[PDB]
mmCIF file of C-alpha atoms in Angstrom:
data_model
loop_
_atom_site.group_PDB
_atom_site.id
_atom_site.type_symbol
_atom_site.label_atom_id
_atom_site.label_comp_id
_atom_site.label_asym_id
_atom_site.label_seq_id
_atom_site.Cartn_x
_atom_site.Cartn_y
_atom_site.Cartn_z
ATOM 1 C CA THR J 1 -83.725 26.929 214.771
ATOM 2 C CA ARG J 2 -83.376 23.531 216.625
ATOM 3 C CA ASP J 3 -79.726 23.233 216.109
ATOM 4 C CA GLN J 4 -78.319 23.594 219.530
ATOM 5 C CA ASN J 5 -74.765 22.346 218.729
ATOM 6 C CA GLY J 6 -71.862 24.261 220.240
ATOM 7 C CA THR J 7 -70.019 25.327 223.267
ATOM 8 C CA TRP J 8 -72.081 27.782 225.369
ATOM 9 C CA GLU J 9 -70.821 30.196 227.999
ATOM 10 C CA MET J 10 -73.153 31.472 230.726
ATOM 11 C CA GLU J 11 -74.122 35.015 230.687
ATOM 12 C CA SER J 12 -76.703 35.072 233.362
ATOM 13 C CA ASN J 13 -78.488 32.716 235.853
ATOM 14 C CA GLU J 14 -81.611 34.168 237.610
ATOM 15 C CA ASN J 15 -83.426 32.387 240.544
ATOM 16 C CA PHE J 16 -81.071 29.392 240.687
ATOM 17 C CA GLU J 17 -81.501 29.702 244.405
ATOM 18 C CA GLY J 18 -85.247 29.191 244.156
ATOM 19 C CA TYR J 19 -84.962 26.266 242.026
ATOM 20 C CA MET J 20 -82.276 24.575 244.345
ATOM 21 C CA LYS J 21 -84.735 25.244 247.287
ATOM 22 C CA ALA J 22 -87.590 23.803 245.510
ATOM 23 C CA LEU J 23 -85.266 20.596 245.142
ATOM 24 C CA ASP J 24 -84.511 20.571 248.794
ATOM 25 C CA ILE J 25 -80.916 21.380 248.275
ATOM 26 C CA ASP J 26 -79.386 22.290 251.667
ATOM 27 C CA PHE J 27 -78.383 25.830 252.920
ATOM 28 C CA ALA J 28 -74.497 25.171 252.719
ATOM 29 C CA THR J 29 -74.772 23.844 249.180
ATOM 30 C CA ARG J 30 -76.918 26.646 247.948
ATOM 31 C CA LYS J 31 -74.382 29.085 249.368
ATOM 32 C CA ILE J 32 -71.482 27.492 247.560
ATOM 33 C CA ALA J 33 -73.412 27.896 244.360
ATOM 34 C CA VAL J 34 -73.884 31.789 244.643
ATOM 35 C CA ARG J 35 -72.541 33.434 241.446
ATOM 36 C CA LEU J 36 -71.317 30.254 239.801
ATOM 37 C CA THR J 37 -70.836 30.214 236.109
ATOM 38 C CA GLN J 38 -71.158 27.286 233.511
ATOM 39 C CA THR J 39 -70.100 26.191 230.202
ATOM 40 C CA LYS J 40 -72.334 23.820 228.345
ATOM 41 C CA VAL J 41 -71.108 21.642 225.456
ATOM 42 C CA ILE J 42 -73.804 20.305 223.283
ATOM 43 C CA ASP J 43 -72.955 17.598 220.510
ATOM 44 C CA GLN J 44 -76.256 17.190 218.767
ATOM 45 C CA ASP J 45 -77.016 14.732 215.715
ATOM 46 C CA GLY J 46 -80.689 15.571 215.007
ATOM 47 C CA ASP J 47 -82.669 14.086 217.946
ATOM 48 C CA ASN J 48 -79.549 12.556 219.533
ATOM 49 C CA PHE J 49 -77.877 14.857 222.213
ATOM 50 C CA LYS J 50 -74.777 14.497 224.243
ATOM 51 C CA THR J 51 -74.377 17.249 226.699
ATOM 52 C CA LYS J 52 -71.829 18.282 229.366
ATOM 53 C CA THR J 53 -72.552 21.229 231.732
ATOM 54 C CA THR J 54 -69.507 22.326 233.855
ATOM 55 C CA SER J 55 -70.041 24.527 236.814
ATOM 56 C CA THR J 56 -67.204 26.772 238.016
ATOM 57 C CA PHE J 57 -68.000 28.165 241.492
ATOM 58 C CA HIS J 58 -66.874 31.497 243.002
ATOM 59 C CA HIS J 59 -65.235 30.096 246.104
ATOM 60 C CA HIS J 60 -64.738 26.257 245.736
ATOM 61 C CA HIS J 61 -61.766 24.346 244.586
ATOM 62 C CA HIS J 62 -63.398 22.119 242.271
ATOM 63 C CA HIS J 63 -66.006 22.198 239.254
ATOM 64 C CA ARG J 64 -69.000 20.059 239.115
ATOM 65 C CA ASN J 65 -69.965 18.186 235.929
ATOM 66 C CA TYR J 66 -73.557 17.360 234.907
ATOM 67 C CA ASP J 67 -73.337 15.311 231.683
ATOM 68 C CA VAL J 68 -76.708 13.984 230.218
ATOM 69 C CA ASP J 69 -77.222 12.194 227.061
ATOM 70 C CA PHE J 70 -80.523 11.359 225.403
ATOM 71 C CA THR J 71 -82.568 10.853 222.268
ATOM 72 C CA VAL J 72 -85.701 12.818 221.810
ATOM 73 C CA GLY J 73 -88.799 10.690 222.545
ATOM 74 C CA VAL J 74 -86.822 8.005 224.470
ATOM 75 C CA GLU J 75 -87.328 7.995 228.257
ATOM 76 C CA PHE J 76 -84.064 7.769 230.300
ATOM 77 C CA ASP J 77 -83.067 7.363 233.842
ATOM 78 C CA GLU J 78 -81.315 10.442 235.476
ATOM 79 C CA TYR J 79 -79.461 10.390 238.831
ATOM 80 C CA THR J 80 -78.967 13.949 239.822
ATOM 81 C CA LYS J 81 -75.684 13.545 241.786
ATOM 82 C CA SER J 82 -74.537 17.162 241.466
ATOM 83 C CA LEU J 83 -77.929 18.443 242.338
ATOM 84 C CA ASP J 84 -80.701 17.003 244.645
ATOM 85 C CA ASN J 85 -79.363 13.434 244.271
ATOM 86 C CA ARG J 86 -82.573 11.916 243.194
ATOM 87 C CA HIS J 87 -83.464 9.206 240.575
ATOM 88 C CA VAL J 88 -86.045 10.725 237.966
ATOM 89 C CA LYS J 89 -87.454 9.363 234.764
ATOM 90 C CA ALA J 90 -86.728 11.963 232.082
ATOM 91 C CA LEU J 91 -88.430 12.436 228.679
ATOM 92 C CA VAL J 92 -87.182 15.065 226.143
ATOM 93 C CA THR J 93 -89.617 16.204 223.343
ATOM 94 C CA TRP J 94 -89.884 19.091 220.844
ATOM 95 C CA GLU J 95 -92.396 21.873 221.310
ATOM 96 C CA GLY J 96 -91.873 23.439 217.926
ATOM 97 C CA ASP J 97 -88.352 24.601 218.092
ATOM 98 C CA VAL J 98 -88.161 24.376 222.047
ATOM 99 C CA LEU J 99 -86.456 21.354 223.558
ATOM 100 C CA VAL J 100 -88.617 20.135 226.392
ATOM 101 C CA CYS J 101 -87.686 17.858 229.321
ATOM 102 C CA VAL J 102 -90.104 16.504 231.830
ATOM 103 C CA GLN J 103 -88.375 14.905 234.829
ATOM 104 C CA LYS J 104 -90.981 12.439 236.005
ATOM 105 C CA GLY J 105 -91.066 11.896 239.842
ATOM 106 C CA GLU J 106 -92.592 13.230 242.974
ATOM 107 C CA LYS J 107 -91.954 16.898 242.196
ATOM 108 C CA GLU J 108 -94.661 18.727 240.077
ATOM 109 C CA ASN J 109 -93.575 20.883 237.083
ATOM 110 C CA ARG J 110 -89.984 19.384 237.243
ATOM 111 C CA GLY J 111 -87.934 19.797 234.046
ATOM 112 C CA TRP J 112 -86.526 22.284 231.695
ATOM 113 C CA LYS J 113 -86.983 23.940 228.251
ATOM 114 C CA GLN J 114 -84.103 25.002 226.059
ATOM 115 C CA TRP J 115 -84.060 26.940 222.903
ATOM 116 C CA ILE J 116 -81.849 29.217 220.530
ATOM 117 C CA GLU J 117 -82.242 32.954 219.908
ATOM 118 C CA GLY J 118 -79.658 34.262 217.552
ATOM 119 C CA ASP J 119 -76.324 33.263 218.928
ATOM 120 C CA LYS J 120 -77.695 32.554 222.436
ATOM 121 C CA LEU J 121 -79.111 29.637 224.148
ATOM 122 C CA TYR J 122 -81.868 30.033 226.629
ATOM 123 C CA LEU J 123 -82.593 27.412 229.318
ATOM 124 C CA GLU J 124 -85.448 27.635 231.903
ATOM 125 C CA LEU J 125 -85.238 25.153 234.684
ATOM 126 C CA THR J 126 -88.535 24.398 236.703
ATOM 127 C CA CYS J 127 -89.554 22.779 239.792
ATOM 128 C CA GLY J 128 -92.663 23.139 241.781
ATOM 129 C CA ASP J 129 -93.590 26.914 241.479
ATOM 130 C CA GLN J 130 -90.027 28.027 240.702
ATOM 131 C CA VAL J 131 -88.399 28.927 237.378
ATOM 132 C CA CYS J 132 -84.545 29.573 236.905
ATOM 133 C CA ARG J 133 -83.755 31.464 233.730
ATOM 134 C CA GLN J 134 -80.364 30.972 232.195
ATOM 135 C CA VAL J 135 -78.843 32.579 229.109
ATOM 136 C CA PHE J 136 -75.709 31.368 227.294
ATOM 137 C CA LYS J 137 -73.692 32.935 224.438
ATOM 138 C CA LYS J 138 -72.195 30.740 221.809
ATOM 139 C CA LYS J 139 -68.475 30.684 222.072
#
């Protein structure tokens, strides 16, 4: 299914460290991120998406919020203020039922793929030779 609507609560996050390192995020910031959790809210109307990803940290007094809206097939600008603070040109497409984002810029293989299995949302974030695998359950 391509229907990704819902509120999604993180159940696992593997190799977020390596993904952050591939984006050149500094040591202190990666350390703050250890064992964070997230809730991701997706409001999807066909190819039109509004998404809000809220990170809650283990030992930091505030959340971070990464909200991205897009239409499949329509390139858009991203300013990754809560990650590596770069400007990329993002394009989201479908590969079958997999939602695929390429973040065009200097880094090779930068983007993500997101798909549904049962009541779970899978997200694989990529940069360079690093893959971060996340799983969320529908709330």
